[PDB]
Amino acid sequence: FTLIELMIVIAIVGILAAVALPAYQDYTARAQVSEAILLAEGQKSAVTEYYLN
Amino acid sequence: SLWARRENGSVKWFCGQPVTRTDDDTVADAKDGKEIDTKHLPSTCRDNFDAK
């Protein structure tokens, strides 16, 4: 007879999270890799010097 | 440590981890545990006690 505004809007936020799930999940991974890269670098110094010397 | 060696008429200098002099032409590792770690030493100061 009535109450569908609460039911649909709770189910659009539910599906909104499902659509926002893979975006945050590669943005996220892509973020965790960007650090492996920062940890890898800064060690270029040692390696560069060792090679040139 | 920096130590030298008789070249005969002149001397040559070395640079590296702590050393002790034995005789006028021989030194040896001042092995004791307080030497600056190889990683902190320049490429120009990697000399060994028996470098010639």
Side-chain angles (χ1 to χ4, degrees), chain A residues 4-53:
Chain A
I4 211 160
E5 224 93 294
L6 192 81
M7 197 177 73
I8 293 172
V9 175
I10 199 76
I12 60 160
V13 173
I15 65 161
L16 199 79
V19 175
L21 226 286
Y24 199 61
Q25 243 55 234
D26 280 335
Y27 179 71
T28 272
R30 195 183 309 120
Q32 319 173 303
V33 174
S34 297
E35 291 317 274
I37 294 179
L38 232 300
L39 225 189
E41 306 165 294
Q43 306 214 289
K44 286 162 64 171
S45 169
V47 173
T48 290
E49 237 49 354
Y50 190 108
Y51 183 75
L52 267 20
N53 280 169

